[PDB]
Structures are given as structure tokens and as C-alpha cells.
Amino acid sequence: SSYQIAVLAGDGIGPEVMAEARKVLKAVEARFGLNIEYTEYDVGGIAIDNHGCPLPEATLKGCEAADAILFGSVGGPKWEKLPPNEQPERGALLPLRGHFELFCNLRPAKLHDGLEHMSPLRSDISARGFDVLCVRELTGGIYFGKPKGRQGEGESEEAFDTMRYSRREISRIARIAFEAARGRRKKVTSVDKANVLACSVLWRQVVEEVAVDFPDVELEHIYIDNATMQLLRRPDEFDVMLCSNLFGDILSDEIAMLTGSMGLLSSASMNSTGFGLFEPAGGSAPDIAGKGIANPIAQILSAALMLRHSLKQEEAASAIERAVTKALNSGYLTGELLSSDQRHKAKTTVQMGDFIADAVKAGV
Amino acid sequence: SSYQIAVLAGDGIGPEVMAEARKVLKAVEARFGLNIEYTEYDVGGIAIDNHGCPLPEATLKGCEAADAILFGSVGGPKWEKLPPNEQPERGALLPLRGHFELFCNLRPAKLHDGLEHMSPLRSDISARGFDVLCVRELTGGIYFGKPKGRQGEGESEEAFDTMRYSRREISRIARIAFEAARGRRKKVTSVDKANVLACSVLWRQVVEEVAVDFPDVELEHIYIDNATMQLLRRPDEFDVMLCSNLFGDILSDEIAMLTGSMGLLSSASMNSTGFGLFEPAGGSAPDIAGKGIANPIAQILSAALMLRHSLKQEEAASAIERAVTKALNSGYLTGELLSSDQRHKAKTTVQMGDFIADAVKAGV
Numbered sequence: 001s002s003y004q005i006a007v008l009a010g011d012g013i014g015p016e017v018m019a020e021a022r023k024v025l026k027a028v029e030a031r032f033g034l035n036i037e038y039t040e041y042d043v044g045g046i047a048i049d050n051h052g053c054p055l056p057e058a059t060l061k062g063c064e065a066a067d068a069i070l071f072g073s074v075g076g077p078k079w080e081k082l083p084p085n086e087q088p089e090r091g092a093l094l095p096l097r098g099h100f101e102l103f104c105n106l107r108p109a110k111l112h113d114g115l116e117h118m119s120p121l122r123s124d125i126s127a128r129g130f131d132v133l134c135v136r137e138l139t140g141g142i143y144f145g146k147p148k149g150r151q152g153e154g155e156s157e158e159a160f161d162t163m164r165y166s167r168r169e170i171s172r173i174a175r176i177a178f179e180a181a182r183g184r185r186k187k188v189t190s191v192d193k194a195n196v197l198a199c200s201v202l203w204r205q206v207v208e209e210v211a212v213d214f215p216d217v218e219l220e221h222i223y224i225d226n227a228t229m230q231l232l233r234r235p236d237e238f239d240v241m242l243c244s245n246l247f248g249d250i251l252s253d254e255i256a257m258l259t260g261s262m263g264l265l266s267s268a269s270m271n272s273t274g275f276g277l278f279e280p281a282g283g284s285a286p287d288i289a290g291k292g293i294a295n296p297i298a299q300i301l302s303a304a305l306m307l308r309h310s311l312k313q314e315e316a317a318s319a320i321e322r323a324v325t326k327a328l329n330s331g332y333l334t335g336e337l338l339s340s341d342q343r344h345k346a347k348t349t350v351q352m353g354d355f356i357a358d359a360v361k362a363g364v
Numbered sequence: 365s366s367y368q369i370a371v372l373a374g375d376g377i378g379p380e381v382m383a384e385a386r387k388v389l390k391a392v393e394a395r396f397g398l399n400i401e402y403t404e405y406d407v408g409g410i411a412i413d414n415h416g417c418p419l420p421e422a423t424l425k426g427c428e429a430a431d432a433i434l435f436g437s438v439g440g441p442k443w444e445k446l447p448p449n450e451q452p453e454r455g456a457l458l459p460l461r462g463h464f465e466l467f468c469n470l471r472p473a474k475l476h477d478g479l480e481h482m483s484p485l486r487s488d489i490s491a492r493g494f495d496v497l498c499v500r501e502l503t504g505g506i507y508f509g510k511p512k513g514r515q516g517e518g519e520s521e522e523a524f525d526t527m528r529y530s531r532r533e534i535s536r537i538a539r540i541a542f543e544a545a546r547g548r549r550k551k552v553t554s555v556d557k558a559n560v561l562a563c564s565v566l567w568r569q570v571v572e573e574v575a576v577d578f579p580d581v582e583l584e585h586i587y588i589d590n591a592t593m594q595l596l597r598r599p600d601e602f603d604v605m606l607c608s609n610l611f612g613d614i615l616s617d618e619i620a621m622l623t624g625s626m627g628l629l630s631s632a633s634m635n636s637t638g639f640g641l642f643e644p645a646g647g648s649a650p651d652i653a654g655k656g657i658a659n660p661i662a663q664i665l666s667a668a669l670m671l672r673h674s675l676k677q678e679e680a681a682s683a684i685e686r687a688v689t690k691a692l693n694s695g696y697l698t699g700e701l702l703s704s705d706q707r708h709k710a711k712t713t714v715q716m717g718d719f720i721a722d723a724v725k726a727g728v
């Protein structure tokens with residue numbers, strides 16, 4: 001039958017970049033004969049304005065009826081001063097991930113050929129390139145651990161959060177990292193704080209247990225503070241980084257900025273049945289919203305990750321990825337990927353979606 | 365009477381760099397007429413080899429009798445496979461900080477004039493310079509929170525750690541950050557994860573309460589994942605970063621590597637009475653130990669931080685800092701601060717201590 005997609009564009013540049021993702025999806029649908037139906041639902045700030053909360057019931061129900069969630073971006077200055085639970089990002093993303101048991105977050109990041117110069121690394125380091133996939137555990141640890149809250153009053157008032165992990169939780173995400181490494185350059189770097197946290201001692205121990213199934217894959221451990229330093233000095237030496245929830249949050253953001261190319265980066269957050277939520281790694285960028293400036297590549301590659309991981313349409317997924325490579329090596333760059341002099345050559349959001357869709361059609 | 369210093373050189377390059385710190389201290393003692401007595405105690409790997417644990421009773425007692433701890437570095441491959449509690453770093457540093465209530469960690473980091481090129485940042489970013497002081501809360505949060513440990517067996521075996529903070533704990537470290545900002549460029553950036561952690565919601569709230577005493581100081585908040593990105597793009601825009609224990613651990617390491625000059629960086633860990641532990645930010649570097657290669661500046665500036673903060677000898681502290689500036693701008697650089705061609709000009713550990721001590725003597 002038809003695949004069914006819940007489309008949650010959100011705030012800021014979400015809707016403009018989502019339009020280009022749908023345009024390129026239309027081209028892949030025609031080329032590969034896929035029957036996909038999409039339904040739109042509010043989420044984040046637009047949900048608070050239209051429904052009074054950032055994750056309305058009808059949106060949640062819409063996502064339960066779908067094969068995957070194609071997600072834009074949430075948040076903006078309008079809602080930033082609401083109580084923390086009522087804000088767009090916390091209010092949408094944490095309950096979506098908990099409800100759908102999206103324990104696996106994949107954040108691929110690489111320096112693209114020809115854009116090594118946009119990286120904030122020293123030129124000799126960025127010239128060496130990098131390609132680092134972060135596999136982050138997304139529904140356990142300190143994010144969802146209990147007890148969480150506060151007690152007391154005044155000076156003695158105290159807050160608490162609890163980080164918890166079981167062997168089962170560590171081994172499921174570790175298996176994903178090792179299998180991904182096997183398909184890459186055969187190295188997992190597991191990131192913990194095993195000199196301080198009991199959860200990191202168990203993490204390190206269980207990763208070593210899972211390693212026995214993968215004697216072809218190199219395993220190393222690195223402390224999270226050290227990892228922030230080593231990714232500056234030798235990012236070319238990492239392949240897959242295997243991280244708990246909070247450490248994956250932190251390290252995947254540093255690796256993303258090290259690319260200098262945030263508008264190219266996508267994320268996949270999956271459960272064990274292969275349902276997932278696919279979104280750009282970057283923000284809502286409300287300052288450039290509605291201008292046709294925004295880079296729609298991250299949203300377009302989020303659609304390719306959705307085709308691969310939720311829809312089992314690998315040919316359609318890679319055809320999108322190649323059309324994006326074609327745009328980047330064929331003079332089709334948005335403003336933020338151009339050196340400040342070459343800027344007159346910037347393409348708009350729709351010029352980029354048109355070129356990438358036409359490339360899919362032309363059989364790239 | 366005499367000040368009394370407990371000298372804990374540790375492992376690796378600790379003893380060679382400590383010798384240069386004592387040499388420069390002898391020169392400051394003569395120039396400023398300070399009467400200081402030093403006693404040496406084992407700590408870390410050398411304590412495990414000599415005493416069977418990394419923090420012997422006699423060493424702990426020695427530190428209780430002192431005005432401050434002048435600390436080298438602990439750890440090395442020899443002890444890296446011991447059980448986590450028995451290892452040099454965890455086994456020495458966590459109990460020292462807990463026992464002496466060293467709640468305040470200060471990690472000053474800047475790009476030195478003329479060495480902006482050693483930074484791993486893109487040349488146009490490092491040319492802009494930076495000077496970022498990290499104030500890290502060191503005895504609370506998840507490091508010392510209870511309950512901590514594990515329960516269960518097999519797949520359901522689970523570990524847990526608890527992050528806790530009280531208003532009292534947040535406000536003492538926040539006051540330090542604001543006072544330090546007042547003496548600098550009047551900006552505090554408080555780093556939290558207030559969209560996820562109850563402790564970060566209380567952190568953010570209490571920092572805003574303390575802010576009312578400092579209307580001259582700008583306050584901003586930044587999420588820890590965002591902070592790892594912003595320090596790559598605009599490190600010149602930060603002055604004081606105010607961090608909880610785990611987030612300070614992580615961010616101070618990224619800022620240290622961004623200098624490209626780890627061998628110049630020192631740390632101070634203080635309690636409310638002004639007693640503290642002063643150490644280099646870098647590792648034991650056991651590969652270069654005993655060679656006269658190691659940069660002793662970080663150990664020497666740790667002695668200057670000790671003079672200022674524990675001994676209330678500001679003139680002696682700044683005379684050391686200026687002698688270090690003189691060495692750096694007068695052609696006295698260790699091997700790791702030289703571009704690979706200029707390397708023949710490297711100075712040894714003792715050449716550097718001799719030059720810095722002679723500069724103190726000459727009245728720099």
C-alpha cells in the first residue's frame with residue numbers, strides 16, 4: 001500500500017526548507033514508482049500559537065498513524081520565555097522520543113570536498129578531511145531518569161536529576177554503532193566518563209561485551225572532556241562515535257560546527273521497528289525565515305535518511321544524496337557556504353530544491 | 365611565620381616541571397622576602413608504587429598541615445588498567461577535592477601574542493585572539509551526588525548516578541564568576557542544560573538571582589551543546605564561563621585545546637578559606653618524561669596562582685607571570701610551541717626554568 005508520512009515542519013525556516021524536501025521527494029516518487037502520502041501537522045511554536053501546546057494530541061495521533069515523521073525545526077524568540085515544559089523544543093522533541101521509543105540517534109557529519117575551508121579548523125587540519133558518524137543513545141541516561149525535580153526552600157532548596165542505564169539499553173545502541181562501523185572504516189570510539197560515573201563504568205563494560213561479536217572492528221574508549229580536545233586535533237582519526245544521551249548531545253554539536261556546514265547536516269532518531277523522526281541538525285533560524293536564503297540540503301537529506309531507514313528504499317535515498325553532491329560540485333551553493341567575496345553567486349532555497357529535484361529526474 | 369606548601373609532583377613529567385617551579389619560587393622568595401617551606405609527598409601512580417594507593421594517609425595529613433598544595437600531574441599507562449577507584453587520577457583528585465571542600469575551580473585560558481598560530485582554529489579566528497576564564501563548580505553536581513552505583517544482574521543490571529545542586533552551592537560559585545567578570549571584561553556566560561535537567565533549571569534561576577548584585581556585569585545563558593559550537597565560531601566574545609561540575613569539565617578541556625598551547629595552562633581549585641590545589645591543566649605525558657622536553661610554564665604559573673590565591677602574595681604571583689611573558693616574547697619556547705621548521709630553536713625544561721627564574725631575579 002502507500003507509505004504514510006507525518007510532516008511536522010515547525011517554525012522558522014522549517015516550512016520553506018520542507019517545501020524543497022517535498023519537491024525532491026516528488027521527483028524520487030516518480031523516478032522509483034513509490035506511492036507515498038503525506039499529512040501535515042503543527043508542532044513547536046506554530047502548535048502553541050494554533051493549539052496552545054507544542055505537541056497537540058492530533059499531531060501525536062498523526063505520527064502514530066505514520067511510517068515515519070519528516071520533521072523541520074522548532075523554536076524561536078516568540079516562545080523562548082515560556083516555562084521550560086511549555087517551550088517548543090523540550091515540549092515537542094522529548095515526548096516524541098519517549099513515546100515512540102526512539103532510542104537511536106544517528107548524526108552523520110563530514111567535510112564535503114571543496115568546502116573544507118568553511119570549517120572553523122586550521123587549514124592544514126581541515127584539509128585532511130573528516131567523516132564522523134555520531135550514534136547517540138536517545139531515550140535513556142539523565143534525560144528520562146527518575147527521580148527528577150526539586151525539594152526544600154531557600155538556600156537549602158535542591159534540585160536533582162538521575163542518570164540511569166541498563167545493560168540492555170547500552171547493548172542495543174552499541175550493536176548499532178558496531179554494525180555502522182563495520183559498513184564504514186571499522187572503528188568505534190565509545191565516549192564516557194568512567195573515571196566519575198557509575199553509568200559510564202557500566203557503559204564501558206557493556207560496550208566491551210558487545211565488542212566480542214565484532215573482532216573486525218577496532219574499539220577504543222575516550223573520556224568526554226578528552227574527546228572535545230581530540231576532535232579539534234585529529235578528527236580524521238574517528239569513524240563512529242558511540243555516546244550516551246548527554247555526551248552525544250554535546251559531542252555531536254561540536255562535530256557539527258567543526259564541519260562549518262550545518263545546513264548540510266541531517267539526523268535520524270529511530271526505534272527498533274525502524275519507525276523514526278528525520279530532521280535537520282540546525283536551528284529554526286527565524287532571522288532568515290521567509291526570505292528564500294535558507295539552505296534546504298539538511299531537510300532534503302533528512303528525507304533521504306527517512307527513505308533509507310524507515311521506508312527501506314535505499315535506491316531512492318542514495319539518488320537524493322547524489323543529487324545533493326551534484327549541486328555542491330556544480331556551482332549550486334547557498335549564501336552561507338560561499339566565501340564573502342563569492343557571495344554574489346549564492347543560490348536561493350528554491351533554486352537549490354529545483355536543481356536537486358531536476359537532478360533526481362535526470363537520473364543522477 | 366613561614367608559609368607551608370605540600371608538594372605533590374606525581375607521575376610522568378610532574379617531577380621535572382615541579383623542579384622548575386621550585387627554582388622560580390626560590391627566586392621570588394629572595395626577591396620579595398617570603399619565607400616558604402615545602403614538604404614533598406607521593407600521590408598518584410608513584411604513591412601506588414610506594415604506598416599501595418594513590419592518596420596515602422601521610423599525604424592527606426601533609427596537605428592538612430599546609431597553606432596550599434602545589435600539585436604536578438597524575439596517571440600513566442602503568443596504572444591505567446587498575447580498577448577505577450584504585451587509579452591515580454580518580455583516586456587522588458576526587459578525594460582531595462571532596463575532603464578539602466575545593467568547590468571552586470578556576471581555569472584561565474588565553475591565546476598568547478605570537479602563538480595564535482598554534483591554535484587548531486582557522487587562522488582568521490585565532491587572529492582575533494581570546495581570553496576565557498572557566499569557573500567550574502568542583503564538589504557538587506553528579507560527581508559527588510548520591511545515590512551512585514548499580515543494582516540487578518544480567519540484561520536488567522542498571523547503573524545510576526545522581527546530579528544534585530542546592531541554591532547555596534550555585535550561589536557561592538556564581539558569586540566567584542561575577543566578581544571575576546567585574547575584574548575582566550564584565551561578562552558572565554552561564555552554561556547549563558535547562559531544557560533537560562532540573563539541576564540546570566535551578567542553576568539558571570539562582571544565577572539570575574545572584575546577578576542582581578552585579579548590574580555592571582552582562583549575564584547570558586547558553587546550552588552546553590551550543591557552547592561547544594560557539595567557542596569554535598566566536599571565542600573572542602566570551603569572558604567568564606560559569607559552569608557546573610560536569611559541564612565545566614567538558615568545556616574547559618575544549619577551550620584549553622583551542623589555545624593550541626596546553627603547556628601554558630594552569631588551574632586553581634579552592635575552598636572558601638582560600639586554601640587550594642594548584643596544578644597544570646595538561647597530562648603526565650609519560651612518553652617525554654625524564655627527557656628535558658616538557659614545557660614547565662604550566663607548573664610555574666600554577667605556583668603563581670598559588671601565591672595569589674592561597675598565599676595573598678599578588679606582587680610575587682605577577683612577577684612570575686611577567687617572567688613567563690618575557691620568555692615567550694624573547695625567544696624562549698619549548699619544542700611543542702614551535703612550527704616544525706623552527707624546532708631547532710626549542711629550549712629544554714631547564715633552560716626555560718633558568719630563564720624565568722633569572723628574569724624574576726632581574727626584576728621583571
Ligand SMILES: CC(C)[C@H](C(=O)O)[C@@H](O)C(=O)O
Nearest residue numbers: 089090093094249559560589
Ligand atoms: C532541545 C534539546 C532537548 C535537544 C537535546 O538535548 O537532545 C537538542 O539539543 C537536540 O540535540 O536535539
Ligand SMILES: CC(C)[C@H](C(=O)O)[C@@H](O)C(=O)O
Nearest residue numbers: 195196225453454457458613
Ligand atoms: C580525572 C577526572 C576525575 C577529572 C575531572 O573529571 O574533574 C579531570 O578530567 C579534570 O578535569 O581535572
Ligand SMILES: [Cl-]
Nearest residue numbers: 141142245246
Ligand atoms: Cl546521559
Ligand SMILES: [Cl-]
Nearest residue numbers: 505506609610
Ligand atoms: Cl554536574
Ligand SMILES: [Mg+2]
Nearest residue numbers: 249250253589
Ligand atoms: Mg543538542
Ligand SMILES: [Mg+2]
Nearest residue numbers: 225613614617
Ligand atoms: Mg577533565
